[PDB]
């Protein structure tokens, strides 16, 4: 059917953005150096490593099997689901990371310049990487994600609630909670320079581009990433049941939001004008 | 003021009392130069990189 | 009054060297120089970087070894280069931060600097303790230093921003000399290849020409449009290039006692912080306040190259003294070699 | 040679009218801000009245707002200030000013002693 | 020859990581310039704070060092440059000089449209606010006749006047507030801003304005830099 051809050119597209947009930014962050010096560049470079990585590891596989109608590889299947839960969740934990950093450095920014070396921002940097690998590869090669062939098992009860709130409901708590915090010491900036500039004057956009910039950034990670761990909190409890086409779509879905955090979070004056420097 | 006028006029005809050569063979003499050193300036012809101290 | 008359006086005097100038301008270097093959495209690409400095960069200064050199950041440092290996041989601090200029003696002694504090610092780098301190330290000037460069290891000139020049010895820390005449801020010196006689730019769009041994000024020029803030000779030593924030360069000769030639594009319109010929004279490097660096050929007055490798400001540069190649300083806290 | 002469100006009797006009050479008119600055006797300088590089952008001192008015002609290079209802205070040595730099919105012209591109000056008397 | 390589590595090492510790040490200090008139109170912020080119002091383990220039001419132009990335200028101004309130204002103007500087935020200090108030009850020097603007200015609706202070001197101080913020949102445009603040001489809560609005400019910069504000 034409089906099968726009579905294998979608996951093709997905990929090929994906893997160009992190290794553009990548790129840019190895190329220069005025990138690479400031201290929150770090989490950017490591969010898009981590979306790189899945890139590279999840998303071909799953395309290849979406598109055969069954999974050939066999036994790579056990490493697979490990690769996926140490790299997603390797992008979640960035985007939490990164909140915070933003967190500090708009609610103290004397202490942001102090206490703040590029050792805490490796500290930072590890304990991620490190949750994402242990909580992925010690459960998948002892098997616990498997309840008691084609990849389409979802997971195991306990271990499907554990992980979840491990990988998906702290780090997007933290993130409201930072992002709020961050809006209202905005809207105090923002209504304190109105007031001056209305008494200049005599003598609302700005809230909403706060508000626009904001929702964005936490309505496309939420959007993208939401309805796939619902998903995976309900199945398994009780497989009111969702089709394994529509999980597979949310989890592509939750996947793509790779694709799209560069433009969120590369984008910057400076990664500009290093993507112009490098594409002509 | 006027000791500064004073030192202006007399600064002006010390300059002016100068005697100064043509245009065209000051000129000349500047080509002269330029083309005389222009096979031993390494920035003007580029130096193969084996003798270049800032290339490997 | 008496005054009066000085004044109109003064204006003949004026009109007479302005004459005697139209008696000698018979041509224009250009259809002097139309003839000449134009040096070609000149693609200069960024050989070594050197990086370190914590702040904005404003002098720099080459051996006369073409290895070693020294700039100054207004971090309160001043860090010595092996540009070969971009090994840093010592890291000066200063006990004021806002240097503004600094100069390495041609036998490699001693470094100077100054700035803000209205001192020009000595620092001996031959010590025999160990590291490099404070030796000499000039004081008398009510002005910040702007430029300064050696002679010899005891005798040193330097520029001011109380409109006035110095000569220095380094010894004794007596002003030997006295250059006085200009009306606005000395942002720039320049020593003939000779040692004998020096050039100043001034913020009254003027440059005037100095005796050495004799503190006479000799020539004045009056070519800019606006502050001048940079100099530098040809090689042969009988004409000079000026650089202003009209974002025009100049070239004046000596013996002809006027302008020959004028640098400039008409998408050009920021001013220009430094300028420098090459070994020939043939090249003419020019920085400005739009990121790059400017090569004219200073007989054709076409560009024959641009250098956008700096983000901010560049602020200082330099040829070597054996023409292998050219340093920049910039507000970016960079410098770099273009060979 | 960046010259400047101011011309205009003398004995006027209070509620006279006066047209001072500064002729500029050596530098481009157009791609400068200009200034009219007054020196009262007894007491330094205080900057007048200013201009834009095309004339779109005017301003004036508190004391002759509404009084003096200022104009370029870019094509005769010239520098206009009508004066208006003059005061006995308005007595003072009058000067056009050149801001440093082209294609810039501020400038330091006010110096107490030496500023290089500053006019001569020309002695205005209000005086019964 | 090789030896004098090591040599000379061992040395950029003992170099770079003296530089490390600089660079620490640059990084948390607040340099703060401060820049005005002479006979406008400068000397006495400084005095209060605890004439001399330089001052050193801390807000809450916060370290700043502000610099004013003494021996230097009054052509600031050139030597202004020196000072685009200071983290802010304090700009003291007389509140009760009416002479001298244009050649502040053109100052300031001159300040804040400088190619150079067009990031850096000014706190604006108007000193003398208790000879102001003299000035203005005595009634003797009036400022409709300096700023005929002054006549027509109604008292701003945000204006908050200490107890027992006359409605007369509250509008005199917010009209020169006003008249320095006219100037300030003109062409400001988010790059940098300016924070009016009422002082007199004796005035001891001033190292703490500083904190607070250098805490404020830092703020501002993170925010817009991350493309919110
Ligand atoms: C653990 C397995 C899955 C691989 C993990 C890769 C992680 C640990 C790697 C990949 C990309 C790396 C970052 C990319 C580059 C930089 C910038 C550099 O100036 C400091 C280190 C830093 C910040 C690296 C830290 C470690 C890092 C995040
Ligand atoms: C359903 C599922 C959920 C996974 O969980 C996560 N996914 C991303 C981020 C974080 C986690 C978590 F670790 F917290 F779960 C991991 C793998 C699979 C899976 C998929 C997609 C499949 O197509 N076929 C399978 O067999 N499996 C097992």
Redesign the pocket.
Known sequence: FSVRILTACFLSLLILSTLLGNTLVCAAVIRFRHLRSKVTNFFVISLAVSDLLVAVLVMPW?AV?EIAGFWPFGSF?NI??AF??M???AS?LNLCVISVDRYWAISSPFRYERKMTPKAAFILISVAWTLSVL??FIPVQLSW??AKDN?????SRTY?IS??V???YIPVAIMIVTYTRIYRIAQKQIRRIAALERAAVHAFKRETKVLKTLSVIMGVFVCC?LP??I??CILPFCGFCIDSNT??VF?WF?WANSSLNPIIYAFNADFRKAFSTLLG | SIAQARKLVEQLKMEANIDRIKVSKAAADLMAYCEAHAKEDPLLTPVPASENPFRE | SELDQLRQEAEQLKNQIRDARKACADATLSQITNNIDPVGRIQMRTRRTLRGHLAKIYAMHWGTDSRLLVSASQDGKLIIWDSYTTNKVHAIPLRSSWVMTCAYAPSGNYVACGGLDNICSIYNLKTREGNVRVSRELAGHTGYLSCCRFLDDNQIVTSSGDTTCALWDIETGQQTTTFTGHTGDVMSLSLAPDTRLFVSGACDASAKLWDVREGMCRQTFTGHESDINAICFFPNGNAFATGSDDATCRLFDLRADQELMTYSHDNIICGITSVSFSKSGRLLLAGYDDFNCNVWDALKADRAGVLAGHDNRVSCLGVTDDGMAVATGSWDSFLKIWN | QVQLQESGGGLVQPGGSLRLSCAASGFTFSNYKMNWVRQAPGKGLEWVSDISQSGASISYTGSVKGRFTISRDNAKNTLYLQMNSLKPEDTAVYYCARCPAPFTRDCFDVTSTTYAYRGQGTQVTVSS | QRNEEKAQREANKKIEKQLQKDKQVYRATHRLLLLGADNSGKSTIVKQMRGIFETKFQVDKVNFHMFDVGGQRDERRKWIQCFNDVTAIIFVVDSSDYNRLQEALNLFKSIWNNRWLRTISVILFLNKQDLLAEKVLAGKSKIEDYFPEFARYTTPEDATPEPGEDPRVTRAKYFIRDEFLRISTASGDGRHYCYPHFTCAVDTENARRIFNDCRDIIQRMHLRQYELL
């Open positions: 799953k099997a299947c697979w689901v996926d839960i790299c997603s969740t979640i909580i992925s994600h498997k990849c389409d098992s979802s997971l499907a992980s979840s491990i990988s998906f990433w796939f761990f998903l995976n999980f597979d989890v939750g």
